[PDB]
Design a binder for these strands. Structure first.
Ligand SMILES: Nc1nc2c(ncn2[C@H]2C[C@H](O)[C@@H](COP(=O)(O)OP(=O)(O)OP(=O)(O)O)O2)c(=O)[nH]1
Ligand SMILES: [Mn+2]
Ligand SMILES: [Mn+2]
Length: 175
DNA sequence: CGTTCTATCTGTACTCAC
DNA sequence: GTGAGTACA
DNA sequence: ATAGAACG
């Protein structure tokens, strides 16, 4: 069911202090600095088809556990699909049902994953096609050339975009 | 030779063979 | 266990 | 962003 930008932000704000995962007995809280709003919400589209959240996980050992044992305090939801990297929930928010999409990235993948999950799709396609012509492959995990991770000296998304030789635009204006 | 239109990526989760 | 086909991020 | 194709 479709939702407004404002509704999207209220939901994300509510989830931001309430996400956790079960890890061998212990309930472990997910920190706010590891929750990044992505998709059309980040791009500030007036109407959203869903809410898209990227979760930064500190260790590779945790991937088996975070999404598959995801917990949301005081909220009822069902699980449509769930793996280590993509989880789709249907959540009850103020008597209505909405789609929440959760994705995981490792610290070293962060800027690549924010770039990828921010979209929009058409932007990603043209950017990736251009890199492909110069014999590179870009995905949510990194920049690859001949199946080898290229070690870029970069922390943020903005640094990545510039490093790739493309114009930086705020998410609202990417196309 | 300029204008305008067109096309283009990459990977995850689930199901169902065999 | 692996590969193909679908749906969808 | 880039480059090819149709059109002028
Ligand atoms: N490379 C790539 N990335 C995608 C694709 N589909 C989705 N994504 C990424 C970029 C999107 O902004 C992000 C979320 O996808 P959604 O389908 O939720 O679309 P988005 O939120 O942009 O709009 P919407 O949900 O319809 O309001 O995931 C795809 O086909 N290819
Ligand atoms: Mn979305
Ligand atoms: Mn989504």
């Amino acid at each position: 069911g479709m939702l407004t930008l404002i509704q999207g932000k209220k939901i994300v704000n509510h989830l931001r202090s309430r996400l956790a995962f079960e890890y061998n007995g212990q309930l472990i809280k997910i920190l706010s600095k590891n929750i990044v709003a992505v998709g059309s919400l980040r791009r500030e589209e007036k109407m959203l088809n869903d809410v898209d959240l990227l979760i930064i996980v500190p260790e590779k050992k945790l991937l088996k556990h975070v999404l598959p044992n995801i917990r949301i305090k005081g909220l009822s939801f069902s699980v449509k699909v769930c793996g280590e990297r993509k989880c789709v929930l249907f959540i009850e928010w103020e008597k209505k049902t909405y789609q929440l999409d959760l994705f995981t990235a490792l610290a070293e993948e962060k800027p690549y994953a924010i770039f990828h999950f921010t979209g929009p799709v058409s932007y990603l396609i043209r950017i990736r096609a251009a890199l492909k012509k110069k014999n590179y492959k870009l995905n949510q995990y990194g920049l690859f050339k001949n199946q080898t991770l290229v070690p870029l000296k970069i922390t943020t998304e903005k640094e990545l975009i510039k490093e790739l030789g493309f114009t930086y635009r705020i998410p609202k204006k990417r196309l």
